[PDB]
Ligand binder design. Structure first.
Ligand SMILES: CC(C)CCC[C@@H](C)[C@H]1CC[C@H]2[C@@H]3CC=C4C[C@@H](OC(=O)CCC(=O)O)CC[C@]4(C)[C@H]3CC[C@]12C
Ligand SMILES: CCCCCCCCCC(=O)N(CCO)C[C@@H](O)[C@@H](O)[C@@H](O)[C@@H](O)CO
Ligand SMILES: CCCCCCCCCC(=O)N(CCO)C[C@@H](O)[C@@H](O)[C@@H](O)[C@@H](O)CO
Ligand SMILES: CC(C)NC[C@H](O)c1ccc(O)c(O)c1
Ligand code: NA
Length: 288
């Protein structure tokens, strides 16, 4: 029994250490590549930097803390840090999906009014966009959490809030539905709708020719970013709505799983950016 625990503990700590490393390595690379390569300092890559920062926070903060939880079987860090950890978790997913929308809108704009785009998109304005995203994201994630709008009346739940070694995010139905809709479902819809317009206007372009194939590989890359993010988080967000209506329909282990799949997504973008010649050559440079 104490052997089964020691085996599991150490093998899990390892897998965990790996995912931390993969996320932090991958995203530092992306930030450095962009930071040190003028060729890669497009306005669009500013949003990528932002998205990589969200993933970076998941790597440095979110995953390590949740790893100690998954490994040791309790929250070691006390109540305040549990709330902060919970916030940083919600913040990141919110910032990611909002930044993806911005990216999709940037691309729709550049593809359908290259001239208006030219005289409306500047570095100074791209920074305002990024900050506004983080501002709205913080607004929507921190305040209700710090202000306890999320808590439940149930005595089983009240037992967990009092237990300083419990860090379970048991929420009332109102918050479950609300935060899901506000932080994920609405920007998910917006992003899809916009990304389908981008696809249309890109296919009503085909009918120099190499200039247009290079742009279309880049577009499809962003496409994959958005698709993969959706697959990594939608199963969690459906299961979240469903629990509000029936806690028996979907097994608990699968609810935990879908959340980790969510965290896993922060590892993926740097791999996907390898489709691009420039990133790949910058990745070889840096790693020496
Ligand atoms: C909480 C949920 C419901 C919000 C989800 C919506 C966001 C994903 C998107 C939809 C459209 C985006 C907005 C579209 C345009 C802008 C203008 C943009 O930058 C500027 O206006 C710079 C102008 C300047 O100051 O000179 C600021 C961000 C903002 C509000 C964007 C921030 C994110 C928005 C609101
Ligand atoms: C952007 C996210 C914002 C979400 C804001 C949700 C705030 C709503 C707060 C809320 O709905 N409750 C108080 C929570 O402080 C009610 C719950 O406590 C509920 O458990 C009880 O009223 C039950 O008795 C239901 O019949
Ligand atoms: C769109 C706003 C509709 C209000 C949202 C409340 C949904 C809550 C439904 C619910 O609590 N149950 C589903 C009832 O089948 C659980 C019952 O099985 C028992 O509590
Ligand atoms: C393990 C818990 C803290 N993970 C929370 C999950 O990432 C989440 C993200 C956004 C939400 O709106 C939400 O309710 C829940
Ligand atoms: Na607790």
């Amino acid at each position: 029994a104490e052997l089964l625990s020691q085996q599991w503990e150490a093998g899990m700590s390892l897998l965990m250490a790996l995912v931390v490393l993969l996320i932090v390595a991958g995203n530092v690379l992306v930030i450095a590549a962009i930071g040190s390569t003028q060729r890669l300092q497009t306005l669009t890559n500013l949003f990528i930097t932002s998205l990589a920062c969200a993933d970076l926070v998941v790597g440095l903060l979110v995953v390590p803390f949740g790893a100690t939880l998954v490994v040791r079987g309790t929250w070691l860090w006390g109540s305040f840090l549990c709330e902060l950890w919970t916030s940083l978790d919600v913040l990141c997913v919110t910032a990611s999906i909002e930044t993806l929308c911005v990216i999709a809108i940037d691309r729709y704009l550049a593809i359908t009014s290259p001239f208006r785009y030219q005289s409306l998109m500047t570095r100074a304005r791209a920074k305002v966009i990024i900050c506004t995203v983080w501002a709205i994201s913080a607004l929507v994630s921190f305040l209700p959490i710090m202000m306890h709008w999320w808590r439940d009346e149930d005595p089983q739940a009240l037992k967990c809030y009092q237990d300083p070694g419990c860090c379970d995010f048991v929420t009332n139905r109102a918050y479950a539905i609300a935060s899901s809709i506000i932080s994920f479902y609405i920007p998910l819809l917006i992003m899809i709708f916009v990304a389908l317009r981008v696809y249309r206007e890109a296919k009503e372009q085909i009918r120099s020719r190499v200039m247009l194939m290079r742009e279309h590989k880049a577009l499809k890359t962003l496409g994959i970013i958005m698709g993969v993010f959706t697959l990594c988080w939608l199963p969690f967000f459906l299961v979240n709505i469903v629990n509000v209506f029936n806690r028996d329909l979907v097994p608990d282990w699968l609810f935990v799983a879908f959340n980790w799949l969510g965290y896993a997504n922060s590892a993926m973008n740097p791999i996907i950016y390898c489709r691009s010649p420039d990133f790949r050559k910058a990745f070889k440079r840096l790693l020496a």
